[PDB]
């Protein structure tokens, strides 16, 4: 089994050195969406079942665990991902380089359970462990 | 084709008699957002193009005309809607019962454009004609 | 002329979603009764004349046509309203959302003291989708 | 080593979609008793020794751990199985789909006539998700 840890550390270092943080984050979000396209959960009926299927998908690749919770007062879906893979000291905070990948992945995975054409955005929430990533899923551009 | 003007006059009278002004306004804003869900403009690039597409959508249903202006110092989008359909003497001022529908419709229409993020609020600014509605859109603080 | 078809579709959707069926039906019956106070037929002593006047009012508002028949088994009145305006897929059956409005409207129109049917009560009961059958019973 | 987790998830999905719960539970109990005929513990006269042997078998197949308790109020055995393998969100509660398999397996294992618990019958009953509690009563 090839080891990509050192290669990914060097790749993250070089990408951060050549391009900015925003470009890298957009590229990693696109990669996360593509990864979600690669592996799908089945159509779930509850939050607990979706959490179980997403945890099974994450264990298939060993990318950590996930917890989903619904904030009715905040109109959000709090997503807490634990044990995100660490690739070097890159990222903000250091060691969280693969977080936009999680953003895109969870956006695609949860949108797969939505209607035909939904507009949702998963945004990282910027104590909590270093490798623990907290994100919220909300509709994009609501009006009142 | 059926004429719903008298029916809408009676419905506005009955709703204003049974429920309050705030409940009616919230229901009409919900109806406006649903209407914006039903018919939408294409993703526009400038204010002029969006104004043209919104005017085309309004002419599709004959609900009036619209002008959009960007106020940088006020950090708002002024929306001036002319020839709002009138259904009786209900509303504040009288004859402007369908104004919260415009609020919800314009909020949904503009928030659906690319580049919009977060929570936005469309409020009605209360010289102008009776059926002319002036609304200001800004980020919900 | 403004078009309220899409607005009424969305309004029916929202009202059915929020309050339900019975509350919506009562509200629409009240709206029909209020409409009966805006346009009224003249006092008619016969079913045929009243039917003609009601058809004239419906043509004035463009809400369809009506046929009235007097059943001698109980001296009841059967009201068949064809071409009810359709305001979407809401209602029971779908496409019939203004039927309680018809209930209230015919209750106000038919029951006039100066006429001959001022003691009746409304009741909605292979027909086309927009055809509404109502019964007036003393 | 082939991985059957995704296959088992999809198979549980399809079986639950096609046959339901009671039929699926009966089939999984059949599978559990069939598994019992393939791996068996030695005849044990003591609950502690039986627990050790069952834990050895479970470690052989990797299906969690078990604890046995002989209640005194009634001659019944409380079986607490921790770390039941999870295959998808199927089952009641979600994640516990191989629980009837445990029922059949423990019915076959415990009721060996050469031991002392040969007349027991399984009856599945804060608790962790993958923890299964069953009762065996004479």
């Amino acid at each position: 089994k090839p080891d990509f840890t050192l290669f990914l550390q060097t790749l993250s270092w070089e990408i951060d050195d050549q391009v900015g943080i925003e470009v890298r984050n957009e590229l990693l979000r696109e990669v996360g969406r593509g990864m979600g396209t690669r592996i799908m959960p089945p159509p779930c009926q509850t939050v607990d079942k979706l959490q179980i299927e997403l945890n099974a998908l994450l264990a298939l690749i060993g990318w950590g665990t996930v917890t989903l919770e619904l904030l009715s007062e905040d109109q959000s879906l709090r997503i807490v991902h634990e044990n995100l893979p660490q690739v070097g000291s890159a990222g903000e905070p250091s060691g969280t380089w693969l977080a936009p990948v999680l953003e895109g992945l969870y956006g695609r995975w949860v949108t797969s359970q939505a209607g035909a054409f939904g507009d949702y955005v998963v945004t990282r929430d910027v104590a909590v462990p270093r490798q623990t990533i907290i994100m919220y899923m909300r509709v994009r551009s609501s009006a009142t | 084709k059926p004429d719903f003007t008298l029916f809408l006059q009676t419905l506005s009278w009955e709703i204003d008699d049974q429920v309050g002004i705030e409940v009616r306004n919230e229901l009409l804003r919900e109806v406006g957002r649903g209407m914006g869900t039903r018919i939408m403009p294409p993703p526009c690039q400038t204010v002029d193009k969006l104004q043209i597409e919104l005017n085309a959508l309004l002419a599709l249903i004959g609900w009036g005309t619209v002008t959009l202006e960007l106020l940088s110092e006020d950090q708002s989008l002024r929306i001036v809607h002319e020839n709002l359909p009138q259904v009786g003497s209900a509303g504040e001022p009288s004859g402007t019962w369908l104004a919260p529908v415009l609020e919800g419709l314009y909020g949904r229409w503009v928030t659906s454009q690319a580049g919009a993020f977060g929570d936005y609020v469309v409020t009605r600014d209360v010289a102008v004609p009776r059926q002319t509605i002036i609304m200001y859109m800004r980020v919900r603080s | 002329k403004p078009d309220f078809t899409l607005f009424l579709q969305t309004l029916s959707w929202e009202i059915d979603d929020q309050v339900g069926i019975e509350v919506r039906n009562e509200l629409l019956r009240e709206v029909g009764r209020g409409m009966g106070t805006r346009i009224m037929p003249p006092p008619c002593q016969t079913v045929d004349k009243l039917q003609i006047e009601l058809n004239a009012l419906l043509a004035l508002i463009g809400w369809g046509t009506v046929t009235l028949e007097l059943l001698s088994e109980d001296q009841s009145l059967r009201i068949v309203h064809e071409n009810l305006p359709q305001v979407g897929s809401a209602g029971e059956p779908s496409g019939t959302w203004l039927a309680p409005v018809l209930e209230g409207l015919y209750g106000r129109w038919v029951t006039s003291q100066a006429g001959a049917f001022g003691d009746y009560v409304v009741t909605r009961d292979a027909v086309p989708r927009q055809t509404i059958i109502m019964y007036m019973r003393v | 080593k082939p991985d059957f987790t995704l296959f088992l998830q999809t198979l549980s999905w399809e079986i639950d979609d096609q046959v339901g719960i009671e039929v699926r539970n009966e089939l999984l109990r059949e599978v559990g008793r069939g598994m019992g005929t393939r791996i068996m513990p030695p005849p044990c006269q003591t609950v502690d020794k039986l627990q050790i042997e069952l834990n050895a078998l479970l470690a052989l197949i990797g299906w969690g751990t078990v604890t046995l308790e002989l209640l005194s109020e009634d001659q019944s055995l409380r079986i607490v199985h921790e770390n039941l393998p999870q295959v998808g969100s199927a089952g009641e509660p979600s994640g516990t789909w191989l629980a009837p398999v445990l029922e059949g397996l423990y019915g076959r294992w415990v009721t060996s006539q050469a031991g002392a618990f040969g007349d027991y019958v399984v009856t599945r009953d804060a608790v962790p998700r993958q923890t299964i509690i069953m009762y065996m009563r004479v």
């Binding site: 949702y120 899923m137 | - | 309050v19 | -």
Partner: peptide
């Protein structure tokens, strides 16, 4: 079971009262 449904989740995300006001009358 014991958790919101996915349809409930997407209605919450996308989404006195009219019913209460009508009941009061």
């Amino acid at each position: 079971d014991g958790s919101p449904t996915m349809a409930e989740v997407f209605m919450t995300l996308g989404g006195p009262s009219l019913r209460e006001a009508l009941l009061r009358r």
